[PDB]
């Protein structure tokens, strides 16, 4: 019954398992390097274990020590995106359950895909550099040697030396801070992570950080210039944490801190344990983008406690999380709001399916990533097809109350483990033993393995959506004779959430006649809106509708921030617009060196450059 992580080159969990990592390292901003030792505590699962394989990518290995003595090792040839396999020779055969500790002397490449090294110019303050990591899905290997698979969980401790003037944070509990004693001008920062986690949750940030405390278990961290606003933006965190506890059981990580990164952070959010990372694009000034917060909080259970065993089952992480996320929001804002968000997610799903094509393998809930780079397959599918499956099951089995009971039990049952779609479904049938008959009505094959839209669409309350549809349809079907009647009053009772959904709906039918788009700016002044979601969609609509004036706006948003969600499609749209094509390409080329590494690689691909 063997399950393979086709994304890792390391020895599998059925051979050995890393149980702990002791990391001592220093951050060299001049050399743009991370240097140090990775002491891994490994546990054999086989008798006579004489050698193991670790994952690495662009890693420079100084030495490998075991029991005070250096050991034999090798680096196989690079396997493109998977990096290069590092084989280690054990001086003693190991037997089941026996453990050795391997200390690894390493240096990272300044071109590490897990990292982004920023010049002070690139920072808010302009006087200091900044460094941030991003390991999910498989970039940990780009920072240190490891079994770079979610099927393995370990605890870890780390001490990191950084320039006295800068602050270091990790996805762990801050254990203490002390001056180094080593002919340096560095500080030594300490962290402890008592809960076993998959290595993709390992995270580091170094910079001129300041923090504000916004809850008993929460401080907001960011450069000085973002602190205050962040503090305001995320005010609701603690209340979210409380809901989540009620939904999934106790929060076991201890602290729930937030880190507002610099603009090039590639994601909206990242559930790094004890230190969720978020895009500064969330700072809308009205807390309207807090769902991202609810989301990352939710991972503290679905993802971080119960983890997908391989990236092929990624939907377990994301679909359950979106489900929880939506419940948090429904709890804080209303069931009608939950439904609204759910229906909009279905919309994102329609877009993803249209984009890849309805027969595309990446549209399946359970995928096969053999030979595929996760960064490349990444989409809304696991999020939305996953969420739709859960919503549908909730409706079929009795309701939210009933389904949340299954959810809390599932979390309990699989806490600290890495599992697959089958474990989830086998549990579902077990929990719902009284309803097997209902369960059997679901078309599992289609839902789990068929491409395209789900076999069935759940039911949704239309309360908040109706105004959106009325409005988008009016614009989509408008004639010359309707233009004059549109008016700002049209937006009178629409929340920012509804404006966004209106635009999303409109966008699905782009292009609109240029004259219409112009009228739209004239009556609603969307150019003036700073909310990122709204501007993103508005600008796409504009570009796709061929409005040349929008070119500079689109270029600006695309490069001034680097959240992939916005950056990629803006660049793509601009490249598809004959009028801005050359300039889109040129801008990228000019910006590439200063961009985040994965974003950079994806945009180039998107643009077909290189």
- Return binding residues for Zn(2+): 295, 299, 318
Q: Single out the residue of 600, 604, 584 nearest to residue 539, CA to CA.
A: 584
Taking CB atoms, the residue at the shortest distance from Yb ion is 481
The angle formed by the CA atoms of residues 443, 446 and 448, to the nearest 5 degrees, is: 100
479 binds Yb ion (CB under 5 A): yes
Site string for ligand BES, 272-291 (x = CB under 6 A): -------------------x
* Whether the Cβ atoms of residue 183 and residue 142 lie closer than 8 Å to each other: no
565 binds ligand BES (CB under 6 A): yes
Q: Of 512 and 603, which has the nearer Cβ to Yb ion?
A: 512
CB of residue 76 vs Yb ion: minimum separation in angstroms? 21
Token look-up 């960011």 returns: 222
Q: Is the dihedral of CA 550, 553, 557, 559 positive or negative?
A: positive
Site string for ligand BES, 381-400 (x = CB under 6 A): --x-----------------
269 binds ligand BES (CB under 6 A): yes
608 binds Yb ion (CB under 5 A): no
Q: Of 137 and 551, which has the nearer Cβ to ligand BES?
A: 137
Catalytic member of 130, 156, 189, 383: 383
Q: Of 41 and 420, which has the nearer Cβ to ligand BES?
A: 420
Exposure b/e, 41-57, CB count within 10 A at least 16 = b: bbbbbbeebebbbbbbb
CB of residue 587 vs ligand BES: minimum separation in angstroms? 23
How far apart CA 58 and CA 458 sit, in angstroms, is 46
Taking CB atoms, the residue at the shortest distance from Zn ion is 321
Show the 3-state SS of 339-401: HHHHHHHHHHHHHHHHHHCCCCHHHCCCCCCCCCCHHHHCCCHHHHHHHHHHHHHHHHCCCHH
How far apart CA 134 and CA 265 sit, in angstroms, is 9
Q: Which does 312 bind (CB under 5 to 8 A by kind): Zn ion, ligand BES, Yb ion, none?
A: none
How far apart CA 379 and CA 264 sit, in angstroms, is 19
Mark out the alpha helices in 185-313 (DSSP H runs): 224-233, 237-248, 291-299
Q: Of 121 and 481, which has the nearer Cβ to Yb ion?
A: 481
- Cis before 511? omega within 30: yes
Structure tokens at 304: 């971080």
Site string for Yb ion, 124-143 (x = CB under 5 A): --------------------
Residues 6 or more apart in contact with residue 549 via CB below 8 angstroms: 542
**Is 383 a catalytic site residue?**
yes
DSSP character at residue 2: P
Q: Which of 25, 137, 195, 411 binds ligand BES (CB under 6 A)?
A: 137
Taking CB atoms, the residue at the shortest distance from ligand BES is 268
Q: Which of 268, 273, 451, 454 binds ligand BES (CB under 6 A)?
A: 268
Site string for ligand BES, 305-344 (x = CB under 6 A): -------------x--------------------------
- Rg of the chain taking only CA atoms, in angstroms: 25
How far apart CA 279 and CA 532 sit, in angstroms, is 11
Q: Which does 270 bind (CB under 5 to 8 A by kind): ligand BES, Zn ion, Yb ion, none?
A: ligand BES
DSSP SS3 for 336: helix
Stretch that binds Yb ion, among 63-71, 330-338, 339-347, 478-486 (CB under 5 A): 478-486
Q: Of 163 and 269, which has the nearer Cβ to ligand BES?
A: 269
* Whether the Cβ atoms of residue 601 and residue 375 lie closer than 8 Å to each other: yes
CB of residue 534 vs ligand BES: minimum separation in angstroms? 16
Q: Of 296 and 490, which has the nearer Cβ to ligand BES?
A: 296
How far apart CA 571 and CA 28 sit, in angstroms, is 33
Q: Of 92 and 470, which has the nearer Cβ to Yb ion?
A: 470
Residues 6 or more apart in contact with residue 1 via CB below 8 angstroms: none
Q: Which of 183, 401, 437, 481 binds Yb ion (CB under 5 A)?
A: 481
Q: Of 321 and 599, which has the nearer Cβ to Zn ion?
A: 321
Q: Which does 269 bind (CB under 5 to 8 A by kind): ligand BES, Yb ion, Zn ion, none?
A: ligand BES
* Whether the Cβ atoms of residue 388 and residue 443 lie closer than 8 Å to each other: no
Q: Which does 292 bind (CB under 5 to 8 A by kind): ligand BES, Yb ion, Zn ion, none?
A: ligand BES
Residues 6 or more apart in contact with residue 466 via CB below 8 angstroms: none
How far apart CA 504 and CA 541 sit, in angstroms, is 9
**Which residues on neighbouring strands pair with residue 188, listed in sequence order?**
161, 178
Stretch that binds Yb ion, among 75-83, 95-103, 207-215, 471-479 (CB under 5 A): 471-479
The angle formed by the CA atoms of residues 376, 380 and 382, to the nearest 5 degrees, is: 90
Mark out the alpha helices in 259-334 (DSSP H runs): 291-299, 314-333
Which positions make up the binding site for a peptide? 134-136, 266-271, 563-565
Q: Which does 479 bind (CB under 5 to 8 A by kind): Zn ion, ligand BES, Yb ion, none?
A: Yb ion
**Is 296 a catalytic site residue?**
yes
Interactions with Zn ion, residue window 319-338 (CB under 5 A): 321
141 binds ligand BES (CB under 6 A): no
Q: Which does 481 bind (CB under 5 to 8 A by kind): ligand BES, Yb ion, Zn ion, none?
A: Yb ion
DSSP character at residue 560: H
Structure tokens at 93: 């055969």
Name the packing angle between helices 400-414 and 421-431 (round to 10°): 120
How far apart CA 148 and CA 6 sit, in angstroms, is 11
Q: Which does 277 bind (CB under 5 to 8 A by kind): Yb ion, Zn ion, ligand BES, none?
A: none
Stretch that binds ligand BES, among 29-37, 88-96, 152-160, 263-271 (CB under 6 A): 263-271
573 binds ligand BES (CB under 6 A): no
* Whether the Cβ atoms of residue 105 and residue 121 lie closer than 8 Å to each other: no
Catalytic member of 103, 296, 325, 384: 296
Q: Which of 106, 117, 132, 267 binds ligand BES (CB under 6 A)?
A: 267
* Whether the Cβ atoms of residue 68 and residue 100 lie closer than 8 Å to each other: no
How many residues make up the chain in this entry? 610
477 binds Yb ion (CB under 5 A): no
Q: How many residues bind Zn ion (CB under 5 A)?
A: 1
Which positions make up the binding site? 134-136, 266-271, 295, 299, 318, 563-565
**What is the contact surface with Yb ion in residues (CB under 5 A)?**
479, 481
Please give the residue ranges that form the binding site for Zn ion (CB under 5 A). Answer: 321
| Catalytic positions, written as ranges | 296, 383
Residues in contact with ligand BES by the rule CB under 6 A: 136-137, 267-271, 291-292, 295-296, 299, 318, 378, 383, 565
């Amino acid at each position: 019954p063997e399950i393979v992580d086709t994304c890792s080159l390391a020895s599998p969990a059925s051979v050995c398992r890393t149980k702990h990592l002791h990391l001592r390292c220093s951050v060299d901003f001049t050399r743009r390097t991370l240097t140090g030792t990775a002491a891994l505590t490994v546990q054999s699962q086989e008798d006579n274990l004489r050698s193991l394989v670790l994952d690495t990518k662009d890693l420079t290995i100084e030495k490998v020590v075991i029991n005070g003595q250096e050991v034999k090792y090798a680096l196989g040839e690079r396997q493109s995106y998977k990096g290069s396999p590092m084989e280690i020779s054990l001086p003693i055969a190991l037997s089941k359950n026996q453990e050795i500790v391997i200390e690894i002397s390493f240096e990272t490449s300044p071109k590490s895909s897990a990292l982004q090294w920023l010049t002070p110019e690139q920072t808010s303050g302009k006087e200091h550099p900044y460094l941030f990591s991003q390991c999910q899905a498989i970039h940990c290997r780009a920072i240190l040697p490891c079994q770079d698979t979610p099927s393995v969980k370990l605890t870890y401790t780390a001490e990191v030396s950084v320039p006295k003037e800068l602050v270091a944070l990790m996805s762990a509990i801050r254990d203490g801070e002390t001056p180094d004693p080593e002919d340096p001008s560095r500080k030594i920062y300490k962290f402890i992570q008592k809960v076993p986690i998959p290595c993709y949750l390992i995270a580091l940030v170094v910079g001129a950080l300041e923090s504000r405390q916004i809850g008993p278990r929460t401080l907001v961290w960011s450069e000085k210039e973002q602190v205050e606003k962040s503090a305001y933006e995320f005010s609701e965190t603690e209340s979210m944490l409380k809901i989540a506890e009620d939904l999934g059981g106790p929060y076991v990580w201890g602290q729930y801190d937030l880190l507002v990164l610099p603009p090039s952070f590639p994601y909206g959010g990242m559930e790094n344990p004890c230190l969720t990372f978020v895009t500064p694009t969330l700072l809308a000034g009205d807390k309207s983008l807090s769902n991202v917060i609810a989301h990352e909080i939710s991972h503290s259970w679905t993802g971080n406690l119960v983890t997908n065993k391989t990236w092929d089952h990624f939907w377990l992480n994301e679909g359950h999380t979106v489900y929880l996320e939506r419940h948090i929001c429904g709890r804080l804002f209303g069931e009608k709001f939950r439904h609204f968000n759910a229906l909009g997610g279905w919309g994102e799903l329609q877009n993803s399916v249209k984009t890849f094509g309805e027969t595309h393998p990446f549209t399946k809930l359970v995928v096969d990533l053999t030979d595929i780079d996760p960064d490349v397959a990444y989409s809304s599918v696991p999020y939305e097809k996953g969420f739709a499956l859960l919503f549908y099951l909730e409706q079929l089995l009795g309701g939210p109350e009933i389904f949340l009971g299954f959810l809390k039990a599932y979390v309990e049952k699989f806490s600290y483990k890495s599992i697959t779609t089958d474990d989830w479904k086998d549990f579902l049938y077990s929990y719902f033993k009284d309803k097997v008959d209902v369960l059997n009505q679901v078309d599992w094959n289609a839902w789990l393995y068929s491409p395209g839209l789900p076999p069935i669409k759940p039911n949704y309350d239309m309360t908040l959506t109706n105004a959106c549809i009325a409005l988008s349809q009016r614009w989509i079907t408008a004639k010359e004779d309707d233009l004059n009647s549109f008016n700002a009053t049209d937006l009178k009772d629409l929340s920012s959430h509804q404006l966004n959904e209106f635009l999303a709906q409109t966008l699905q039918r782009a292009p609109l006649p240029l004259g219409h788009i112009k009228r739209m700016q004239e009556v609603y002044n969307f150019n003036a809106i700073n909310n990122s979601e709204i501007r993103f969609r508005w600008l796409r609509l504009c570009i796709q509708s061929k409005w040349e004036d929008a070119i500079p706006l689109a270029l600006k948003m695309a490069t001034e921030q680097g959240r992939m969600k916005f950056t990629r499609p803006l660049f793509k749209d601009l490249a598809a617009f004959d009028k801005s094509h050359d300039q889109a390409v040129r801008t990228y080329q000019e910006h590439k060196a200063s961009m985040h590494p994965v974003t950079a690689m994806l945009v180039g691909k998107d643009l077909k450059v290189d």
